[model samples]
Target: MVKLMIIEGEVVSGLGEGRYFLSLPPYKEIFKKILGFEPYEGTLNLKLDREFDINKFKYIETEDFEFNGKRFFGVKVLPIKILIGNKKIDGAIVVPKKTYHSSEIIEIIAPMKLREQFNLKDGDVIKILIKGDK
Candidate 1:
């Protein structure tokens, strides 16, 4: 069975690395194939009140690969629907194998730059719909 859940998180800032990673050709192709959309250059950071267990959700995974002589880690993406006021956008929560933030902080990516599309600012709270199987 498929289960749906609503979660709230506060918007935060990233270290500017997501832009670089998401733009990489190999990674970009992978996301396009799996997500069926060309991802934006950067990701949106969300800080949750508690740790989120990604294992509980259905997700898609990318393979580990090398780029520019640096090893890039594989990532798992959980498809999500984001709620910004009355507007709902399709996106995903990206969990990189090597991450700087704790489990409470999740990185999100979408076809368009969510910050620009929604005019989101730091500390803004957003709601997201997540799917899981039982």
Candidate 2:
């Protein structure tokens, strides 16, 4: 059976660095291959009470490679469906092999602009349902 996990969080502003990384050729190409569409230029920020273990939910993974002679490690991505009222949006949660934040925050990426599409704003509480492996 596919396990389901739900997380409740509030919308917040992000560091704005995701666009830079997501725009890179390597990440873009890989995301296209796995997600079947190009992601938005930026990501949506969600702040939770604490960080959740991402390893259990990752269903897709990218291998490590080098960019500009600098080596970078692989990342795992969890495909998820975001529910807002009656609308459901397809997206993914990416967990890098290395991160600066502990576990209180998360970033979500989708093909379209989530904030505008979902009519989201800072401080709005949202619930995300994640599908997990059995």
Candidate 3:
């Protein structure tokens, strides 16, 4: 049987780095192949009250690649479903191989702009449902 875990966090503003990273061809291609959808050019940031351990969950990893003489780090993607009230959307939790934020912060990516689609604002609380093997 599959186990489900619910994580809740509040929306927060990011440094706009996710937009730039997702817009890159290599990252976009990797996400598309793995997620079966073209990800939106930006990501939604969420701040949790405590660090969430991702090591216990099933995840897909993107490979590190070089672009324009710069090396980009790989990312671990955990497929999840985002929930706001009765609304739900398919998305993923992205953990970069290298990140400036602490484990308490998570980045979410969907096929469309999650903020626009869900009309999310800073401090809005959302629920993420992740699947794990028992």
Clashes of each: 0, 1, 0
Q: Write the per-residue lDDT of candidate 3 for residues 1-134, one digit (tens) a residue.
A: 86998889999997878899999988889999999888998888899979977777888888899878989888999899999889878899999988889999999999988778778899999999997842
> For residue 123, what is the lDDT in candidate 2?
95
Q: Roughly what TM-score does model 2 have, to 2 decimal places?
A: 0.90
Q: Which runs of model 2 end up more than 4 angstroms from their true locations?
A: none
lDDT of 2 by residue, 55-121 (tens): 6665688998787889877877788887778777888887778866567778778999888887899
Q: In lDDT terms, which candidate is top?
A: 3
The reply for model 1, stretches above 4 Å from the true place, is: none
Write out the backbone clash pairs for model 1: none
| Worst ten in a row by lDDT for model 1 | 125-134
Which is superior by lDDT, 2 or 3? 3
TM-score, each model?
Answer: 0.94, 0.90, 0.95
Question: What is each predicted model's overall lDDT from 0 to 1?
Answer: 0.88, 0.80, 0.88
Give the candidates in order of TM-score, highest first: 3, 1, 2
Lowest lDDT sum, 10 consecutive residues, model 3, at 125-134
In the range 19-72, model 1's lDDT, one tens digit per residue, is 988988888899899989989988898999899877787788888998569888
